[PDB]
Amino acid sequence: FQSNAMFAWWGRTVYQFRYIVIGVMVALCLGGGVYGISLGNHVTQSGFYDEGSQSVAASLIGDEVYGRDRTSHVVAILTPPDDKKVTDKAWQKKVTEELDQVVKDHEDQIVGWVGWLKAPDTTDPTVSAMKTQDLRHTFISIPLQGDDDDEILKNYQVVEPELQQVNGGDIRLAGLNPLASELTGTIGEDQKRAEVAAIPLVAVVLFFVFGTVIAAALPAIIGGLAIAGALGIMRLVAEFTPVHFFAQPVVTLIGLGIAIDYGLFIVSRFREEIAEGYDTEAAVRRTVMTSGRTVVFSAVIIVASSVPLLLFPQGFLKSITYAIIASVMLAAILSITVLAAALAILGPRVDALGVTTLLFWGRLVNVVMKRPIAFAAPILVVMVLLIIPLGQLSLGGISEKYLPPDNAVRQSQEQFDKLFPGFRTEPLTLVMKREDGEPITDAQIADMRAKALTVSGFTDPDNDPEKMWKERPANDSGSKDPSVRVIQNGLENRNDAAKKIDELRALQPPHGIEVFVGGTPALEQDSIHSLFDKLPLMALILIVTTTVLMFLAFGSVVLPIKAALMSALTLGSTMGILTWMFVDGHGSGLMNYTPQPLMAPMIGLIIAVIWGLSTDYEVFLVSRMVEARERGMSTAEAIRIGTATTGRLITGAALILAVVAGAFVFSDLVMMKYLAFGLLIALLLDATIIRMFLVPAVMKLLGDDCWWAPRWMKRVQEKEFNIFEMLRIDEGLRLKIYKDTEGYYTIGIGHLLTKSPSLNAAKSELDKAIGRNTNGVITKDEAEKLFNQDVDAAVRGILRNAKLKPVYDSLDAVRRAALINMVFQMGETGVAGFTNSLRMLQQKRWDEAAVNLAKSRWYNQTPNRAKRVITTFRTGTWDAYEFHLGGIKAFHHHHHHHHH
Numbered sequence: 022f023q024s025n026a027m028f029a030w031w032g033r034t035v036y037q038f039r040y041i042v043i044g045v046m047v048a049l050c051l052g053g054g055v056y057g058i059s060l061g062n063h064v065t066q067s068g069f070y071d072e073g074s075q076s077v078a079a080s081l082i083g084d085e086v087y088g089r090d091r092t093s094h095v096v097a098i099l100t101p102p103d104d105k106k107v108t109d110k111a112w113q114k115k116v117t118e119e120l121d122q123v124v125k126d127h128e129d130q131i132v133g134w135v136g137w138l139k140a141p142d143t144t145d146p147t148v149s150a151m152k153t154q155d156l157r158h159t160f161i162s163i164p165l166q167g168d169d170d171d172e173i174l175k176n177y178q179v180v181e182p183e184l185q186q187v188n189g190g191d192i193r194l195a196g197l198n199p200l201a202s203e204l205t206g207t208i209g210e211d212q213k214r215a216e217v218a219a220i221p222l223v224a225v226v227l228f229f230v231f232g233t234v235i236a237a238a239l240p241a242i243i244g245g246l247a248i249a250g251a252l253g254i255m256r257l258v259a260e261f262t263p264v265h266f267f268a269q270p271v272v273t274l275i276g277l278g279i280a281i282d283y284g285l286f287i288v289s290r291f292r293e294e295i296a297e298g299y300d301t302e303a304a305v306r307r308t309v310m311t312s313g314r315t316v317v318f319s320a321v322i323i324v325a326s327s328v329p330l331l332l333f334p335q336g337f338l339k340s341i342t343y344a345i346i347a348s349v350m351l352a353a354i355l356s357i358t359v360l361a362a363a364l365a366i367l368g369p370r371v372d373a374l375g376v377t378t379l380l381f382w383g384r385l386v387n388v389v390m391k392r393p394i395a396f397a398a399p400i401l402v403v404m405v406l407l408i409i410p411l412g413q414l415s416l417g418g419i420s421e422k423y424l425p426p427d428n429a430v431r432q433s434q435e436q437f438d439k440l441f442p443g444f445r446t447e448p449l450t451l452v453m454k455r456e457d458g459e460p461i462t463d464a465q466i467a468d469m470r471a472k473a474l475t476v477s478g479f480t481d482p483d484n485d486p487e488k489m490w491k492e493r494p495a496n497d498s499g500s501k502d503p504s505v506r507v508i509q510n511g512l513e514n515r516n517d518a519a520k521k522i523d524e525l526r527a528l529q530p531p532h533g534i535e536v537f538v539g540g541t542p543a544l545e546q547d548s549i550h551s552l553f554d555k556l557p558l559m560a561l562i563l564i565v566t567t568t569v570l571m572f573l574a575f576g577s578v579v580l581p582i583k584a585a586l587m588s589a590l591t592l593g594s595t596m597g598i599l600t601w602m603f604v605d606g607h608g609s610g611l612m613n614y615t616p617q618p619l620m621a622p623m624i625g626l627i628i629a630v631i632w633g634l635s636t637d638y639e640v641f642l643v644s645r646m647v648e649a650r651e652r653g654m655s656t657a658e659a660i661r662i663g664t665a666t667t668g669r670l671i672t673g674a675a676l677i678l679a680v681v682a683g684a685f686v687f688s689d690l691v692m693m694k695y696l697a698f699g700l701l702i703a704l705l706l707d708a709t710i711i712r713m714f715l716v717p718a719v720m721k722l723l724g725d726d727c728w729w730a731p732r733w734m735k736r737v738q739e740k741e742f743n744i745f746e747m748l749r750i751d752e753g754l755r756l757k758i759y760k761d762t763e764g765y766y767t768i769g770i771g772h773l774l775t776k777s778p779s780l781n782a783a784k785s786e787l788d789k790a791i792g793r794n795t796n797g798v799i800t801k802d803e804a805e806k807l808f809n810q811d812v813d814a815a816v817r818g819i820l821r822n823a824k825l826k827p828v829y830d831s832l833d834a835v836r837r838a839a840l841i842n843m844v845f846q847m848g849e850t851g852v853a854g855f856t857n858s859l860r861m862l863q864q865k866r867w868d869e870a871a872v873n874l875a876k877s878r879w880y881n882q883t884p885n886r887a888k889r890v891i892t893t894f895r896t897g898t899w900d901a902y903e904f905h906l907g908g909i910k911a912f913h914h915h916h917h918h919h920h921h
């Protein structure tokens with residue numbers, strides 16, 4: 022079951038209203054583009070955790086009662102100039118005043134500054150540790166105003182320009198916000214690196230696919246309107262849900278490439294249509310009915326590959342999922358609206374301006390025909406090697422190591438940790454809430470502590486177990502509700518976390534108190550637990566729905582099961598090279614990144630994206646080889662017909678995508694590099710090794726078993742348009758006796774009954790011809806009967822004429838019908854008058870014949886029918902009749918009215 026009546030309708034409709042269409046959509050895309058530049062101000066950095074987990078619950082309760090921890094917001098290492106010691110009172114007074122200035126100039130953003138520098142005469146050991154022992158360094162804590170991560174980062178980025186000039190500029194800022202500003206700032210550099218490098222490179226790859234400026238520029242314009250509109254959509258989405266920072270580059274990395282690839286593939290088909298002889302209107306419609314459906318289905322495939330990501334609770338993956346969907350749907354819509362309308366207006370003009378104005382696959386597939394196992398077996402091995410570095414991979418949260426090793430903020434963090442060890446902590450929290458609502462007594466606190474001391478592995482600095490699990494600090498932002506108490510202690514090994522959290526939760530609460538285990542390790546481990554929990558379901562939904570969509574596309578059970586195996590191998594192989602690059606560390610030196618575990622949600626994203634890419638490239642390649650089977654062409658070069666037809670397009674499309682992805686591999690954010698490289702690898706793999714070799718090999722051997730259609734699973738083949746339906750349009754179909762334009766009694770399809778004025782003489786003839794008493798009325802079947810006889814009579818007359826027989830034998834079945842049509846209309850003697858045009862048709866000079874025929878009096882007297890017939894001669898298809906300007910008003914009986 023399918024509907025191309027929808028696409029045939031739109032293909033016609035979009036040409037008709039091409040001005041309204043191109044005006045409206047551009048207005049929205051540029052409108053949304055203007056609305057969508059404010060997106061950078063409404064994105065979030067939160068969404069990496071499971072907000073339904075126990076650790077998040079512990080965090081919200083903790084921040085409510087005790088106040089959120091603001092001590093790690095801004096850490097600032099101060100160092101005296103000229104080898105001076107930090108004890109220098111003049112330098113102390115100067116810097117203290119500088120710091121007090123920044124705070125009073127920004128009281129809306131800064132809570133204040135805390136450190137040894139504020140009270141140099143102190144005996145508090147921890148405060149005395151805020152200075153190094155050689156007295157060359159000292160750091161301060163600068164807590165900021167704000168009630169969520171985004172508002173706090175905004176407050177930092179406001180005070181940063183002045184905070185940086187403190188102590189003559191020699192102040193090193195670190196902590197959460199200087200790192201967050203740097204991490205989120207990577208998005209901006211990646212956007213501009215794409216503008217500068219990717220766009221000109223794409224323009225070049227485009228002007229090498231088409232040898233023409235206008236033709237090359239259109240897919241680029243589509244890509245621009247896509248991004249603009251998509252950013253507007255996402256900005257609108259941000260009005261309802263939180264949209265993560267990382268959703269912005271996804272719109273560019275994935276959205277831009279596919280939009281241009283869509284535009285490339287559609288403009289490419291439009292020129293093909295024009296070349297084969299179709300006029301602009303028919304060319305547009307045929308493009309939409311074919312390549313347009315390929316684009317829409319491609320969009321469906323990608324969406325079906327991305328929706329399973331919604332199974333994960335992380336807002337990071339959700340907003341990214343929304344971003345992918347918005348981008349691809351808009352790209353698919355724009356490619357068959359704005360682009361189609363543009364071509365409809367331009368027409369053959371798309372090739373006007375040349376390159377100067379600015380200023381073989383089938384042989385190789387045949388080489389892999391001859392020896393499947395020569396290539397295939399030796400590839401299945403090469404890929405499963407790649408799957409064993411995949412086998413070993415680790416997972417971790419965001420750290421300063423996500424930035425390059427030479428990043429100034431990362432190093433300032435790493436210098437802080439070296440100069441001032443023990444300040445940066447990751448304690449696990451035991452959050453206690455009494456349900457009935459009354460205060461928590463010290464006995465229950467001491468009770469929980471004893472149970473906390475049951476579990477080994479928690480830090481004990483000064484070797485005293487009853488000073489462990491100290492109460493969490495309280496500040497002025499906490500409600501200090503007595504029914505909630507929090508105790509905490511760090512782990513001695515962080516790798517123990519997952520086990521210890523399960524142990525801390527395995528503990529049994531004091532009667533009447535609920536215990537939530539929190540802390541940054543707990544937040545991270547719970548998030549990882551969530552992903553591995555729902556990953557099997559996603560993979561199933563992913564594999565099933567794509568395989569189901571391939572059932573619909575191929576018309577086979579074998580091929581989808583085969584294709585899913587191909588995807589799972591490109592996926593496993595790619596993720597293996599990825600693990601080999603970013604965990605095992607190969608390529609880190611050249612690329613300036615630090616080998617480390619991967620971000621966990623990136624794994625779901627990279628599975629969906631790689632799988633979708635693999636599936637999309639397969640469906641396009643294979644369904645054209647299916648076409649050979651539909652045509653009756655044998656398997657062996659069915660496989661070759663499809664590979665060659667697509668060959669130059671796929672490379673051009675993949676190259677364009679590779680160029681876009683290749684610009685993001687230089688990002689300073691390491692999880693961006695992981696994603697971008699994952700594309701390049703899977704893309705080059707799918708566009709070379711998979712496409713060129715593995716697929717043709719494997720398909721041959723299950724040689725004709727590839728296609729298999731249990732029952733009605735396969736589609737029945739449509740009624741083929743015939744000469745009956747053709748002249749039913751040009752001469753009409755009447756089931757009751759009427760008078761034609763000469764007042765002669767006619768019936769069926771222009772079938773002259775008699776030139777007699779007597780209706781009963783006419784009824785006599787009809788009764789004769791049909792074989793029954795008709796009362797002047799026949800069925801549709803009987804009309805086709807009369808018509809067939811008339812056709813036979815005309816063909817006999819044609820084969821009898823010395824001027825018509827040669828060209829008639831020369832012609833294909835469709836063009837033969839075009840000639841019989843002319844014979845019906847004006848008779849053999851009339852048609853034989855087109856001596857040169859007939860010669861041109863006989864020599865298959867379709868273009869010259871079509872042009873010459875339109876210069877006849879035949880064309881001037883009956884343009885609509887002539888244009889139809891002439892078009893049929895030009896293209897050799899029924900296209901001019903399957904969709905047409907309805908309504909013949911003037912009925913005239915044809916020659917060769919055959920009587921029995």
Ligand SMILES: CCCCCCCCCCCCOC[C@H]1O[C@H](O[C@H]2O[C@H](CO)[C@@H](O)[C@H](O)[C@H]2O)[C@H](O)[C@@H](O)[C@@H]1O
Pocket residue numbers: 092093096135140145147148162195196197200444445446
């Ligand atoms: C990416 C990770 C980034 C790395 C994270 C860096 C963490 C740095 C932590 C810095 C915490 C500095 O420590 C804060 C110390 O002073 C605070 O204020 C107080 O100072 C003296 C009290 O001793 C008195 O003047 C006042 O009571 C009061 O103002 C607390 O009251 C003390 O409890 C605490 O000992």
Ligand SMILES: CCCCCCCCCCCCOC[C@H]1O[C@H](O[C@H]2O[C@H](CO)[C@@H](O)[C@H](O)[C@H]2O)[C@H](O)[C@@H](O)[C@@H]1O
Pocket residue numbers: 066070077080081083084088089090091169170197200201204205208265266267419
């Ligand atoms: C586009 C690229 C993206 C770059 C990534 C940047 C990441 C930088 C790390 C910043 C994390 C700040 O962490 C500090 C806070 O951690 C937890 O609270 C956070 O987690 C809770 C449960 O979700 C929320 O309820 C709180 O709102 C939320 O502040 C603690 O409870 C807070 O006491 C502590 O102050």
Ligand SMILES: CCCCCCCCCCCCOC[C@H]1O[C@H](O[C@H]2O[C@H](CO)[C@@H](O)[C@H](O)[C@H]2O)[C@H](O)[C@@H](O)[C@@H]1O
Pocket residue numbers: 022023024025310311313314315317318321573574640641644
């Ligand atoms: C607001 C309410 C609106 C909500 C509904 C929006 C959802 C849109 C659903 C429409 C799905 C149509 O997509 C499926 C169509 O195209 C696919 O074939 C394409 O793939 C291969 C080319 O590569 C070849 O099979 C064909 O040449 C090519 O058309 C399918 O296999 C066909 O069965 C079907 O004709």
Ligand SMILES: CCCCCCCCCCCCOC[C@H]1O[C@H](O[C@H]2O[C@H](CO)[C@@H](O)[C@H](O)[C@H]2O)[C@H](O)[C@@H](O)[C@@H]1O
Pocket residue numbers: 606607608609610611612683686
């Ligand atoms: C758009 C594309 C932009 C650039 C594409 C680059 C992709 C990187 C593919 C894999 C990188 C290897 O090839 C380039 C690398 O060769 C060497 O590696 C050396 O150490 C590695 C681990 O031990 C091993 O590769 C060898 O042992 C040894 O050759 C250099 O030491 C690296 O500095 C350099 O990176």
Ligand SMILES: CCCCCCCCCCCCOC[C@H]1O[C@H](O[C@H]2O[C@H](CO)[C@@H](O)[C@H](O)[C@H]2O)[C@H](O)[C@@H](O)[C@@H]1O
Pocket residue numbers: 214218219425612613679680681683684687688689
């Ligand atoms: C078939 C595949 C098609 C491939 C298409 C190619 C895409 C076009 C993009 C080419 C622009 C190359 O730009 C290279 C970028 O890195 C440079 O050095 C950095 O290198 C490492 C991080 O990248 C670290 O060491 C430091 O951040 C820093 O030294 C600069 O920081 C940037 O200004 C520059 O833009």
Ligand SMILES: O=C(Nc1ccc(F)c(F)c1F)N[C@H]1[C@H]2C[C@@H]3C[C@H](C2)C[C@H]1C3
Pocket residue numbers: 275279282283286316319323629630631632633634635637638641670671674678
């Ligand atoms: O680029 C894709 N897909 C794709 C890209 C990036 C992704 F991140 C992803 F998930 C994908 F699925 N498909 C192209 C389009 C569609 C169709 C004909 C042309 C143009 C060749 C080929 C197949």
Ligand SMILES: NC(=O)CN(CC(=O)O)CC(=O)O
Pocket residue numbers: 605606607608609610611612
């Ligand atoms: N020493 C190196 O060659 C760097 N290596 C790192 C390593 O050997 O593990 C890979 C690279 O960075 O290209």
Ligand SMILES: NC(=O)CN(CC(=O)O)CC(=O)O
Pocket residue numbers: 854855856857858859873874877
């Ligand atoms: N359509 C035609 O063949 C018209 N021909 C008529 C002919 O061949 O006698 C004139 C021409 O070719 O210029």
Ligand SMILES: NC(=O)CN(CC(=O)O)CC(=O)O
Pocket residue numbers: 751752882883884885886887908909910911912
């Ligand atoms: N379409 C009509 O009503 C009459 N037609 C003549 C015909 O259909 O044979 C004129 C034309 O095709 O331009």
